[PDB]
């Protein structure tokens, strides 16, 4: 015979305090950008990205994160 | 016979205090960018990225992180 | 017969205090960037990145991190 | 008595030939430009120029130049 | 008595030939430019120039020059 | 009495020939430029020049040059 008891406990806390947030600046790609092409052969798929792309500014007033996994597995 | 008891306990705290956040600057790619191409042959896939791409500014007023895994596994 | 008890405990604390955060500057790629290509053959996959790419500014008011693993495993 | 004769002569020529003119490029000021000021006192006249100013491109298909002066003076 | 005769002569030629002019590039100021000022006192005149200024590209298809002065001066 | 005769002669030729002119590059100021000032006193005139200024590219297809002076003078 088998007896399995799984009764974990958690009273934990994750916390922050901040007095103020501000005066934050992000300026990607201020210079001039220039592209020239002549006499090219492509016999297969092409992708191109030119300029100011995919840039992020992220300013959360907290931004705390908790991750928890439980995983019983049996035969 | 088999008798298994799994009863872990957790009272943790994760904590921060900050008096103020600010005057933060990010400026990628201020210089000029220039590309010239002539007489090229491609017989297979091409990808190209030219300029100011994928840059991140990230300013959390806390940003604490707790990660936990439990993993019982039996036969 | 087999009789197993697993009962760990945790009363830990992870903590920080800061009087203020600021006057932080990041400026990648102020110089000029220039590329010329003539008479090339490619029989194979190509990727190209030219400019200011993938740069990060990261300024957490806390940024504490806790990682924990439990792993009982049986036969 | 006075007898003065001034009778200069000139049969001279200035000449050019060019087979073609072209593919000329001028790109002043491709980089980013940035100016910040705090707590300044001025008790007299000020001038300021900021940016891309007073630049010239000049492509004459000839541009030959002859200057001549005759300057008699007497008492 | 005074006799003066001034009768100079000139049959000169100035000449050029060029097979072609081209593929000429001028790129001043590709790098980033940055200026910060705090706590300054001025009690007299100020001039300031910041950036890309006064640049020249000059491509004459000849550009030949002749200068000539005649300057008799009597008493 | 005085008898002055001034009769110089000139049959000069000044000449050039060129097969072609090209592929000429002038690229000043590729590096980043940066200026910071704090706590200065000026009781006198000020001038400032910061950046890429006064640059010249000059490509004549000839550029031949003749200068001449005649100066008779009396008492």
SS (H, E, C) A23-69: EEEECCCCCCEEEEEEEEEECCCEEEEEEEECCEEECCCCCCEEEEE
Provide, as residue numbers in chain C, all residues whose Cβ is less than 8 Å from the Cβ of E32: 27, 30-31
- E29 with F52: CB under 8 angstroms? yes
Are C and B touching by the rule of 3+ CB pairs within 8 Å?
yes
Provide, as residue numbers in chain D, all residues whose Cβ is less than 8 Å from the Cβ of E22: 20-24
Name subunits touching E (3+ CB pairs < 8 A).
A, B, C, D, F
Name subunits touching F (3+ CB pairs < 8 A).
B, C, D, E
Q: E20, E10, E28: which is closest to E66 by C-alpha?
A: E10
Instruction: Measure CB to CB from residue A16 to each of C20, C57, C62 and give the nearest one.
Output: C62
β-sheet with C21-26: strand ranges across? A21-26, B21-26, C21-26
Exposure on the CB side of residue A51, measured as CA atoms within 13 A? 3
The residues, any chain, with a CB within 8 Å of residue A28's CB and separated by 6 or more, are: A52, A55, B26, B27, B28, B29, B52, B55, C52
- What is each CA distance from B75 to A6, B4, C51, C73, in whole angstroms? 16, 13, 55, 9
Q: Distance (Å) from the C-alpha of residue D72 to the closest C-alpha of chain F?
A: 10
Provide, as residue numbers in chain C, all residues whose Cβ is less than 8 Å from the Cβ of F31: 30-32
From chain A residues 19-58, the ones with a CB under 8 A of any chain C CB are: 19, 23, 26, 28-29, 31, 33
The one-character DSSP state at C54 is: S
Q: Distance (Å) from the C-alpha of residue E47 to the closest C-alpha of chain F?
A: 5
Provide, as residue numbers in chain E, all residues whose Cβ is less than 8 Å from the Cβ of F51: 29, 33, 49-53
Q: Distance (Å) from the C-alpha of residue F75 to the closest C-alpha of chain E?
A: 5
Q: F73, E8, F69, E2: which is closest to D74 by C-alpha?
A: F73
Taking phi over 0 as left and psi of -120 to 50 as alpha, with beta for the rest, B30 belongs to alpha
Instruction: Measure CB to CB from residue C61 to each of A18, A23, A33 and give the nearest one.
Output: A18
Q: After which residues is chain B broken (C to N over 2.5 A)?
A: none
Q: State both tokens at D14.
A: 């200035």
Query: Are F72 and E75 inside 8 Å of each other by CB?
Result: no
Place of tokens 């790629």: C29
Report how far residue F47's alpha carbon sits from residue F53's, in angstroms, rounded to the nearest whole number.
Answer: 14
Give the residue from chain A lying closest to D33, CA to CA: A30
Give the residue from chain F lying closest to D56, CA to CA: F56
Are F and A touching by the rule of 3+ CB pairs within 8 Å?
no
- Declared resolution, Å: 2.8
Q: Distance (Å) from the C-alpha of residue F54 to the closest C-alpha of chain B?
A: 20
Angle value at C-alpha E37, between E35 and E39, nearest 5 degrees: 175
H/E stretch holding E66 reads strand E65-70
Report how far residue E72's alpha carbon sits from residue E8's, in angstroms, rounded to the nearest whole number.
Answer: 12
Query: Are F35 and E30 inside 8 Å of each other by CB?
Result: no
C-alpha dihedral, A44 to A45 to A51 to A57, nearest 10°: -140
Are D and F touching by the rule of 3+ CB pairs within 8 Å?
yes
Q: State both tokens at D18.
A: 């060019």
Give the residue from chain F lying closest to E41, CA to CA: F41
Report how far residue E10's alpha carbon sits from residue D67's, in angstroms, rounded to the nearest whole number.
Answer: 14
């Amino acid at each position: 015979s088998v007896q399995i008891v799984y009764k974990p406990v958690d009273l934990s806390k994750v916390t922050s305090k901040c007095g103020s947030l501000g005066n934050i600046h992000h300026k990607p790609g201020g210079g001039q950008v220039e592209v020239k092409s002549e006499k090219l052969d492509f016999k297969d798929r092409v992708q191109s990205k030119i300029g100011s792309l995919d840039n992020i500014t992220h300013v959360p007033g907290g931004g705390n994160k908790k991750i928890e996994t439980h995983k019983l597995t049996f035969r």
